[PDB]
Design a protein around this ligand. Structure first.
Ligand code: ZN
Lengths: 42, 353, 304, 34
């Protein structure tokens, strides 16, 4: 592809892959263990 | 604040804390910190020493002193002397202290610029209309007799642990949970907080609690609907992040401190339902009758009534006679609580050991 | 589906029918019909031999017409033989076809250039070439014949150079036959070609047989760095019911936002807290009737 | 109808009918088509 444009013939292909591309701690509320739900998101 | 409400690129902003110590390479910018590092008289680290020397050697044009009520303290009084600034701004919500040194702020920052009219802000919907109420709790004969025969330090825990306040707090929680109100219950005594958490069955947060546990309790309060009451120690009194709530129950307090009342009341002043018509925030102060709670709460409400709030007294609650759950109704359980309060106060030899 | 896909299928079919043999046409049409195919799929559909598909797959890989995928999967019998999937990379295929036709016409132009020079002189005993530039220094003093340095033989004139018109006619006969290719690439270059892969070709597959040994589902590996619409119909009667509901949430919202009884009223005055017309209308209808007479394998699930 | 998510390796569809209910049990080889 990088020489097809040099030869004037427009390629119909994108550049292929050969071209460069990209704790647990203690709990104090021991009398209510298990009723609290995890909330890792808003 | 500086990143979102004003056009400040992050390269002008630096953080001077324990975890964050990088300092901006520009000629002029922003550094945000706590009074504790600059005013520290102890031995500081070399990086913190370099930051302090840069702060001393650089002429600053303006300083923001958030929560200026801690400025007239012992070492914080020097934060305007080590740091040279032409303009000093004092921003706080509690311009009251128990000592007279609060009146020395004029020697530290300057003349009092502006006083906010709290009724004007409340009637315009800017802040929630708090309903300051004071629920009175009578004494049992044995508890109050034990109150008259001991010293003040034991007396504090004795009038906090009255079963009448337990019944009143349980009834208030039961009443305000049905209305969908988010409830924060403040009490500075950590043993009182633990006893309340054990008796009622609500999460409790104190100073030495794990921080991940504190966040888990906070999001369980904010999002999970089966937890609407959170018990907090003096940690929630200070400027920390807490979820929005409409109901506050103040069981006990650190004596007659006027600052703590407004600090707790400002938590519910930013309620979400302020745009709703007819919304009234609830602020109850549970007091033990004929004891030093009356004196301390009367001293504490002075700043709030000077701001304009009216603390309506409540000596009778409709629902004590037909309450489903009775706390310490039996006399023997009250006695058991009473004596519980009274009883409260060489690489080879290394394997051989 | 896509007309451009039909166009590039026509490209592949015409180039394999023109520049390749019949078996190449068979395998290429098999891959064009069923988008993803394995070796057992070809051996079942075409009844082709492994030794017969050997040169075919080798030539189609060397010309970049068929892409090979080396994925192995996990069958229930766990006999994970290294099956190879034959598919098509459309941009790679059209680039290979364009490069091949451009190189063919450029090589023919160079052959025409090398035929454009004069004939030259051949030595048939030694079978040695001689151009017009290097035969200058091999003449005799008799000025009659070109004498070779080795054979000392009378040189003969090459038949090359006079075939200039033959090579021009070869160019003419190539160029008009390749005209559909040029006309189709005119439409291709004016269009946008998406880069397909094995996963893209899996979206348009046609089953080759009932029971395929090779599973077409892609198995990812770790470490490889190579809505609903519901309507409500009310017959002009239940509107009052919806207003009753609306006022009921209104009244419960006002109740839950109401001031408590101890707030609006002082509680100090009370004790302290502590521990039949059917027959009528039938006769009416009878009267109107009389009057009118008078005047006239299991997996986990979610519900979607 | 019962579907499988993208996290599932084997993707599979289940159709349960109404009146013994009939069960139809369908395998598609592509995620977008499914
Ligand atoms: Zn010769």
């Amino acid at each position: 592809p990088r020489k097809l444009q040099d030869l004037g013939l427009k390629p119909a292909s994108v550049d292929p892959a050969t071209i460069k591309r990209q704790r647990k701690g203690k709990i104090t509320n021991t009398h209510m263990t298990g009723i609290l739900k995890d909330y890792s998101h808003r | 604040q500086f990143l979102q409400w004003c056009t400040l690129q992050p390269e002008n902003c630096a953080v001077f804390t324990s975890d964050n110590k990088e300092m901006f390479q520009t000629e002029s910018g922003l550094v945000v910190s706590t009074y504790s590092m600059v005013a520290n008289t102890r031995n500081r680290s070399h990086d913190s020493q370099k930051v302090m020397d840069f702060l001393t050697g650089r002429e600053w044009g303006f300083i923001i002193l958030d929560e200026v009520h801690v400025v007239p303290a012992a070492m914080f009084r020097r934060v305007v002397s080590t740091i040279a600034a032409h303009a000093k701004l004092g921003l706080t919500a509690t311009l009251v202290r128990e000592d007279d040194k609060i009146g020395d702020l004029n020697f530290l920052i300057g003349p009092k610029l502006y006083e906010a009219n709290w009724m004007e802000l409340s009637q315009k919907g800017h802040i929630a209309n708090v309903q300051c109420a004071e629920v009175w709790c009578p004494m049992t004969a044995e508890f109050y007799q034990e109150y008259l025969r001991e010293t003040a330090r034991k007396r504090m825990l004795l009038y906090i642990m009255n079963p009448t306040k337990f019944q009143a707090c349980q009834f208030l929680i039961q009443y305000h949970e049905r209305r969908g109100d988010k409830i924060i219950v403040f009490s500075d005594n950590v043993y009182a907080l633990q006893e309340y958490a054990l008796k009622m069955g609500k999460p409790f947060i104190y100073g030495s609690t794990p921080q991940q546990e504190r966040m888990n309790i906070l999001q369980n309060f904010q999002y999970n609907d089966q937890i609407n009451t959170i018990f907090l120690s003096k940690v929630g009194d200070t400027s920390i992040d807490l979820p929005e709530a409409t109901c506050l129950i103040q069981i006990s307090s650190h004596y007659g401190s006027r600052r703590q009342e407004a600090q707790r009341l400002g938590r519910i002043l930013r309620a979400k339902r302020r745009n709703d018509e007819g919304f009234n925030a609830f602020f109850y102060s549970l007091v033990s009758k004929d004891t030093q709670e009356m004196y301390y709460s009367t001293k504490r409400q002075a700043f709030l009534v000077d701001q304009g709030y009216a603390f309506k007294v409540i000596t009778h609650l409709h629902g004590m006679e037909n309450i489903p759950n009775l706390a310490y109704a039996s006399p023997r359980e009250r006695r058991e609580l009473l004596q519980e309060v009274l009883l409260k106060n060489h690489p080879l030899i290394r394997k051989m050991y | 589906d896509r007309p451009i896909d039909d166009i590039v299928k026509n490209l592949l079919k015409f180039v394999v029918r023109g520049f390749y043999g019949g078996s190449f046409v068979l395998v290429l049409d098999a891959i064009l019909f069923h988008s993803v195919l394995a070796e057992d799929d070809l051996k079942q559909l075409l009844s082709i031999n492994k030794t017969e598909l050997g040169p075919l797959i080798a030539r189609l890989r060397s010309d970049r017409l068929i892409s090979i995928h080396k994925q192995r999967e996990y069958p229930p019998n766990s006999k994970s033989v290294e099956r190879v999937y034959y598919y098509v990379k459309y941009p790679h295929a059209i680039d290979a076809i364009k490069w091949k036709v451009h190189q063919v016409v450029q090589r023919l132009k160079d052959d025409l250039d090398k035929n454009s020079e004069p004939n030259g002189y051949m030595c048939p005993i030694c079978l040695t070439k001689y151009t017009q530039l290097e035969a200058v220094q091999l003449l005799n003093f008799d000025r009659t014949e070109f004498l070779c340095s080795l054979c000392d033989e009378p040189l003969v004139e090459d038949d090359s150079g006079k075939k200039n018109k033959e090579k021009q006619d070869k160019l003419n006969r190539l160029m008009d036959q390749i005209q559909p290719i040029i006309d189709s690439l005119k439409k291709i270059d004016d269009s946008r070609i998406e880069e397909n892969t094995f996963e893209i070709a899996l979206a348009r597959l046609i089953p080759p047989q009932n029971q395929s040994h090779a599973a077409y589902t892609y198995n990812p590996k770790k470490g490889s760095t190579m809505a609903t619409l519901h309507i409500n119909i009310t017959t002009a009667s239940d509107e009052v019911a919806q207003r009753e509901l609306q006022e009921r949430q209104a009244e419960e919202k006002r109740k839950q936002n109401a001031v408590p009884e101890w707030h609006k009223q002082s509680t100090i005055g009370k004790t302290a807290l502590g521990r039949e017309e059917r027959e009528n209308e039938k006769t009416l209808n009878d009267y109107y009737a009389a009057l009118a007479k008078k005047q006239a394998l299991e997996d986990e699930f979610e519900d979607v | 109808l019962q579907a499988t998510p993208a996290s599932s390796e084997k993707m599979m569809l289940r159709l349960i009918g109404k009146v013994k209910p009939q069960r139809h049990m369908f395998s598609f080889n592509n995620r977008t088509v499914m």
